[PDB]
Scaffold this active site. Structure first.
Site, PDB file in Angstrom:
ATOM      1  CD  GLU A 232     -59.569  25.441 -61.057  1.00  0.00           C
ATOM      2  OE1 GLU A 232     -59.377  25.481 -62.284  1.00  0.00           O
ATOM      3  OE2 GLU A 232     -60.316  24.592 -60.506  1.00  0.00           O
TER       4      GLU A 232
ATOM      5  CD  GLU B 268     -59.534  28.256 -53.150  1.00  0.00           C
ATOM      6  OE1 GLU B 268     -59.523  28.086 -51.885  1.00  0.00           O
ATOM      7  OE2 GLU B 268     -59.263  27.316 -53.961  1.00  0.00           O
TER       8      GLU B 268
ATOM      9  CG  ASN C  30     -65.064  24.608 -60.083  1.00  0.00           C
ATOM     10  OD1 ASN C  30     -64.166  24.106 -60.796  1.00  0.00           O
ATOM     11  ND2 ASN C  30     -64.812  25.115 -58.852  1.00  0.00           N
TER      12      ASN C  30
ATOM     13  CG  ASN D 187     -63.810  20.339 -59.920  1.00  0.00           C
ATOM     14  OD1 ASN D 187     -63.595  21.325 -60.665  1.00  0.00           O
ATOM     15  ND2 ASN D 187     -63.171  20.146 -58.811  1.00  0.00           N
TER      16      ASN D 187
ATOM     17  CG  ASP E  21     -59.768  20.752 -59.824  1.00  0.00           C
ATOM     18  OD1 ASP E  21     -60.640  21.291 -60.548  1.00  0.00           O
ATOM     19  OD2 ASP E  21     -59.122  21.375 -58.934  1.00  0.00           O
TER      20      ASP E  21
ATOM     21  CG  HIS F  62     -56.049  25.498 -71.597  1.00  0.00           C
ATOM     22  ND1 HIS F  62     -57.413  25.342 -71.610  1.00  0.00           N
ATOM     23  CD2 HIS F  62     -55.741  26.199 -72.712  1.00  0.00           C
ATOM     24  CE1 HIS F  62     -57.902  25.911 -72.695  1.00  0.00           C
ATOM     25  NE2 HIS F  62     -56.914  26.478 -73.355  1.00  0.00           N
TER      26      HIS F  62
ATOM     27  CG  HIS G   8     -55.215  24.576 -55.687  1.00  0.00           C
ATOM     28  ND1 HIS G   8     -56.544  24.198 -55.738  1.00  0.00           N
ATOM     29  CD2 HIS G   8     -55.024  25.423 -56.722  1.00  0.00           C
ATOM     30  CE1 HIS G   8     -57.110  24.753 -56.790  1.00  0.00           C
ATOM     31  NE2 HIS G   8     -56.214  25.498 -57.407  1.00  0.00           N
TER      32      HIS G   8
HETATM   33 CA   LIG Z   1     -62.043  23.147 -61.025  1.00  0.00          CA
END
Ligand SMILES: [Ca+2]
Length: 312
Positions: A19, A35, A118, A173, A227, A272, A285
């Site tokens: 992330e 995570e 987040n 998000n 997301d 990004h 993911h």
């Molecule tokens: Ca996110």
């Protein structure tokens, strides 16, 4: 909707919940691994990635009073080369390149307990707009708003106030700020993951939003939805649609995507641009990995690329 299929090149691998891709003021690249767990408890990490080799270094593995973080989103500051990190357990962190960090808020400007965060977005005035889909920060028991509407939005202002600006989202998000061509911030976009919506507000001033509207519709009925998101230099909004195998591209006016980008994986999470290039770094993911691909044009400049003492 037209779909394009650019080449995705692998950047690095094995990053749980990869992330928050971000470049700092010196061009170094970082990712967060929300995570990562140790003995079943949160032990998330902030990593620097050597772009030439793909090698990873953990610069920070934040914990406060024994409560490990779930660092999930990041932006670089402008006046100092330091990272603002949205953390699902710890709220908002500021992390130095040396790996040291500080937790910014246990409570908001009204004295309410802070919620876990987040993602975040600086406007060009230096205010930081933040999504908070978790419940209360540690030491509270961990909760998140995937099923129930208790996610919130904050603005952390230049004068250091953590102001709750809206509430009752089902997993807010990604987030991004649209600017006028002259640099004035004027629209905030917020992803609400499971409802397949992007919401907008008019930004009237620091921590002042109004005119809440359903701005954009995310395709599909898969589990997931929008997301992370990022603007290109023409104010098109690119949005990772986790679970769909695509990044959606919205024109300046929102609505339905004008184009999709097929990814070689099902779960794009965040994206990004590398400054001054067309290269978009994408976390995902399915493989818990990071990739890059070339978009049609350069990215919108982030706040960290602007100059406090600029003239034009
Ligand atoms: Ca996110």
């Amino acid at each position: 909707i037209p779909v394009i299929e650019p080449l995705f090149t692998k950047v690095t691998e094995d990053i749980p919940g990869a992330e928050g891709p971000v470049f700092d003021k010196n061009g170094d690249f970082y990712i967060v691994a929300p995570e990562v767990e140790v003995n079943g408890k949160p032990a998330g990490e902030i990593l620097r990635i050597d772009l030439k080799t793909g090698k990873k270094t953990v610069i920070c593995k934040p914990e406060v009073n024994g409560y490990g973080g779930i660092p999930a989103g990041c932006q670089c500051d402008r006046d100092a080369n330091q990272l603002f990190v949205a953390d699902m357990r710890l709220g908002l962190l500021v992390v130095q390149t040396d790996g040291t960090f500080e937790e910014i808020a246990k409570k908001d400007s009204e004295g309410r307990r802070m919620q876990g965060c987040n993602d975040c977005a600086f406007d060009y005035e230096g205010n930081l707009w933040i999504t908070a889909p978790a419940g209360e920060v540690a030491p509270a028991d961990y909760t998140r708003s995937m099923q129930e509407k208790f996610g919130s939005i904050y603005c952390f202002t230049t004068d250091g106030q953590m102001i709750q600006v809206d509430t009752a989202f089902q997993f807010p998000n990604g987030i991004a700020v649209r600017h006028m061509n002259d640099g004035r911030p004027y629209q905030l976009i917020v992803a609400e993951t499971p409802t397949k919506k992007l919401w907008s507000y008019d930004i009237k001033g620091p921590a002042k939003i109004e005119n809440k509207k359903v701005w954009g519709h995310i395709p599909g009925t898969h589990e997931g939805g929008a997301d992370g998101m990022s603007f290109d230099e023409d104010n098109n909004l690119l949005v990772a649609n986790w679970g769909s195998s695509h990044i959606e591209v919205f024109g300046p006016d929102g609505g339905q995507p004008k184009m999709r980008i097929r990814c070689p994986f099902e779960k794009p999470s965040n994206l990004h641009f590398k400054p001054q290039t067309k290269t978009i770094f994408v976390t995902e993911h399915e493989n818990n990995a990071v990739w890059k691909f070339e978009w049609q044009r350069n990215g919108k400049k982030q706040y960290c690329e602007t100059l406090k003492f600029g003239i034009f």
